[model samples]
Target: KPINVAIFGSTGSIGTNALNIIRECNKIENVFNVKALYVNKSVNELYEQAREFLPEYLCIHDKSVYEELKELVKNIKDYKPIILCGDEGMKEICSSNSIDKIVIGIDSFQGLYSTMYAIMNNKIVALANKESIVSAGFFLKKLLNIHKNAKIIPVDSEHSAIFQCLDNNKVLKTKCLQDNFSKINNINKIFLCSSGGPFQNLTMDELKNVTSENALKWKMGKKITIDSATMMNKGLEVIETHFLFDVDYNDIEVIVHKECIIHSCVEFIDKSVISQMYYPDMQIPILYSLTWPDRIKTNLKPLDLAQVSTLTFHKPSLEHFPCIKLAYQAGIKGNFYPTVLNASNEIANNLFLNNKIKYFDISSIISQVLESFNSQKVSENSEDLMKQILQIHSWAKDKATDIYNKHN
Candidate 1:
């Protein structure tokens, strides 16, 4: 059977890039394929994609847009494809028997259930959705317990580096010219880099007057752009790294690398450090996930050292980007606290995007939300984890609504 693949969030930045990679893969010596495509919105472009890829299964998770999609495809009666819309419809695609692998590109934590469904079905998940593992780290990992086929090759640039680096741990440590390497046991520290967003040099006074328009100078989604300005995106990565490496939050660190040449690094007990660097592109990791255990020759450009004359790194000011500090606090607390932090931050990011909350206040709002959450009832088991996730989601939504109401 051909390696049939299903891609979710087909129209988003990551999704579009993945589609482009898959299109390129089709031209390569005969080894890969794009079986189906799913998108949350952007039906107009998604329709064009379906026609181009000729996927046997196509789903759009918007019921209201279904009529328009159906009408648009009506002329092509000879090439009819299944259409699924709304809440659980996307989840069904992941569990479909025909799909060999599922690449989840959905941006938010809302698609966590669908990702879990794919894992439960023992499909190799090209996990771009960090929330699935963030909330359900052990839950998702548990699915792979009895079934080794259930794998999640990360699509995130940082996690992918850590994953790749971990694969070469012995080799990395073996090169260490140390007197005694016996003391080395586990990962000493993980250093993840951030581009410092668009405001690395701004002081607290400068940040106080920063508007969303000025903050979001780069091309990206609202949540990410806001997070980038505040360095909360780095914080999210901190939490994400903890779960990915199965290490305590305290063991991880984040530094502002303005060039973005160094994506992330991992330091082992032997003082051996492995770093993954590339010319800031999302396509490489996304493409890497699709063709994992094997690196594909992607059209994506490799970092040219001559072009990158110098790489700069700086210590992030916790005073200005309080979310980074708050993330560390939540990570240190462990358990469901990080879950609460992630959910609450998402809500805060959303509010900040809408101008419902002040730019500087985003971190404080998240900190407040997490502070209000009672950790005494935090979950220890899988069942409890799911319950905690729901409670956290509800709490975050309530907090966000309240903040949005007050600010407006």
Candidate 2:
């Protein structure tokens, strides 16, 4: 049977790549059927995808896009999809039983609600949105328990690589899988390899002068590319790795490997180090999350180690990119602190990206929010924690905005 899949951010990088994979898989054999497609505002791109995939449900979270799509839909005959509008309609797509997996490529806070609703509907979530996990992982873990069929398989290349290393332990039970990588799991350390972004070699003085235009390194990356420039992208993945593998934050180590060849590595207690490699492509992990534990053929290029002889590893300079340091500090503290880091970073990154604030302001804002996060006691109760996460998320955004306003 072809896997029925729904893509939450069908117009974005991970989503479009997923559609490509689905097309390729279908070319070889009937492997996937796109049941639902949702995007925020890119109606043209989403329209192109809908034309190819012809999903049963098509949704847009922005009303402007929704109305535009409605006009575009009138141009075609005998190809009517259940057109939907706004975030409420996106949630409806997530809850639909017609789909088996929800491939989430939506960015930041925008992606969280769809992810939660997909899990609640017992759909397999191929999550590329790490912010959802970074901000509310504990509550998500609880949702997984209550909804047994719901599973979140990481679509991030680094975490997917680490997941493959641990796939051999023969423990499929979700309970055991939750925190299995720590004490008795025989893991000495898990290495999250980094590409170190475009600013890796720049001196501190050089980073201060980086223009927003200079940091637009990736084609589809807006917020993500900004995060990558600061190495904050990799930092958020550290917390994502902790939630996915059930590993302790202390045992996780970040290694700067410019090659991007080795996605991640796991060192076992028996002195065995296992790592996963593929040509540095998000599609590798994106496809893997769908065909996991069952390999399928794709058109991606095979590894050519003979042509590339050198691979180097180094330590990230916390002094240069303090966002990395702040991320680690938040995860190690273990509470609503990660929420604070993520919320503050979201606002600060926006300010920097819009050219309202300088690059250094990103870390300074996040650090300040982390300091203020201690004013309240945390709650572990799932419902209460979700509320606290929203509270912290709002406060951090307001606080960071207030800080930015004071200077200007």
Candidate 3:
């Protein structure tokens, strides 16, 4: 039987990689099926993907672009995918009982709502976005109680590595959090690897002259590329790691591994380390997410570690990338702080990308934004949790924007 998939952010990087995995799976007699594809406004890309896969449903979150997308899809010879638009359409896709897997690769805070909706409806989710967990992990943790059949398979390489290392047999039948604490108790440390981006060795003087072009080693969106340069990507990952595995902040560690071959490692109580190494491709993890409790044969190139000759590691320097330290602080502070961290950094990253602020100003804005929310109390109200997250996210964005204008 084919695993029916509904992919959000189908026009983006992770989504594209997922489709590639699906395409390969189909070559082996259609092991995976694309039931739905989604995008915000990239009609051309969406049109191309829809034509190739011919999914049952297509969703465009940007309602204003629906007519244009509809016309574009109409022109595809013999293809008439059921075109849907707006947030309602998104929910409709998520609520489909036919969808076995939901691939969430949407950007920013936008992916959170769809994720929540999917889990509520008892859909299995392949999570590639960090903000969803960073801002709303507690709520998600609680949601798992009702939807025991719902599962979150990580698409990020680091988290995927951690998942592979833990290897709980029970996860094959239950939600990820069900037996997580027992796994966490046995693990001594979670070592997450960072490629150190393209500016790992830059001094403060060198960092001052850094432009967006100087920050490209991986083919990623501008904001993520910028976050990698600032090391905030790893910070967000730290928060994600906390929520995903239910580990304390003190037990998580980040080390620079420029090759990016070793995705991540887990050190057990007796000091034996289990690490996941692959040839630095998103497809590897994507394939795992698609075929969990079962491994599929893929044409991906195997790691030639001997040819690579050597591997190296180093502790992250807080002086060089203060965003990481701030992330730990936010994670420790709990409630509303992670939301503020994600929201403010997003605003600042956007500002820096627009050339409105210097590269270093990104961390400054996040710090200031965190301070503004210092008086906020962590909400115990279940009904108001999501409301609080969204409100703080918006407030942080606005506050960060104001701080950027004042500072820049």
Candidate 4:
């Protein structure tokens, strides 16, 4: 039986890699079916995917572009995929019982909503986005409990590396028919790695003057590339790692692995450390997340660690990467604070991306945004919790703008 998949950000990097993997899977045999495809505004890319895969449903979230999509997709004769538009389309795609796997690669707050909807509907989700997991992991944790079949495989490179290290039975093969990875009992600590971004070599003083052109690296999304430069992405990853594994804040240690060869490591209480290493291609993790408990053959570059010859690790200094400490403060606080950290990071991050603020101002604005909220509402209801998260997400965006205004 072919596994049915609905790729949410099909036009984007992760989704593009996902389809390529699926394409390979089909070449050997029709192993997976592309049932649905989605894009925020890139109808042309979505149209291209729709034509190649002939998915059952195609969605363009930007409603204004819906007619343009229809016009472009109008000539297709292979199969007429039912075109869906806007938020309603997104809701339908996630809720549909026919979709067995959902891949969310959108790099925005909307990923949070899409993920929550899919999880609530008990869908298996391949989560490549960090914001949802970082800002709303508490509710995602709770939702996983309510929906037994629902599973979230961390597809982001670092967390995915950590996930593989924790799964002891990787030698055993099963595509995980039943739910696992959600209930993790631990060992000891986790070693989350950071590439130290573009400014890894820059001093704290030097960081203040770097522009967006100097900040981008690794050829990914603009906002994310910028976040990587700030090392705020690592901080968000820490919060995400804490929530995803239910690990305490103090136990998760972050180190800078400049070589990027050693992805991440997990140390059990017995003092042995298991690490996941590979050539730095994100498609490897994206493929692993969907085909977990079973390793498929692929032509991805393997680790020739001997040829690489050396690896280096260092402690992230707060002076150089203040976002890490700020994230720790929020993650340790454990309530709405993580929400504040993420919300402000998103706003300030975009502010910097647009060249409105200097790269270093991101952390300063975010730290101030964290000060705006003192009240923490402890709620277990996913509905109420999501509402509150979004509410603060909205409020924090505004607060971040003000903070940036005051300073920048």
Q: List the candidates' TM-scores in order.
A: 0.89, 0.93, 0.94, 0.93
**Best candidate according to TM-score:** 3
lDDT tens per residue, model 4, 1-408: 668889988988888999988898678777688999998898778878888998998998888999999998888886777899988998998888789889998877778878877887888799998888888777777787777778888898988888787654642321111223323334478889999888888876788888888887367778888878888999998888887766667888989998898899988777789898987777778877777756777765677878999999999888888999999999998788988899899898888888899866888889888877886666667688878888888899899998878765
Off by over 4 Å in 1: 143-148, 168-186, 376-384, 403-408
In model 2, what are the clashing residue pairs, if there are any? none
RMSD of each: 4.6, 2.2, 2.1, 2.9
In model 4, the clashing pairs are none
Any runs in candidate 3 off by more than 4 Å, and if so which? 75-80, 170-174, 177-185
lDDT of 2: 0.83
> Which regions of candidate 2 deviate over 4 angstroms?
64-68, 74-80, 168-171, 175-177, 181-185, 217-220
The superposed Cα distance between candidate 4 and the true structure at residue 26, in angstroms, equals: 2.5
User: Would you list the C-alpha lDDT of every candidate in the order shown?
Assistant: 0.74, 0.83, 0.85, 0.82
The per-residue C-alpha lDDT of model 3 at residue 193 equals 95
Clashes of 4: 0
Give a tens-digit lDDT track for model 1, residues 244-326: 55656677778888888788888887789988888887777877776666666655566789989999887899998888998
Clashes of 1: 0
Ranked by TM-score, top first: 3, 2, 4, 1
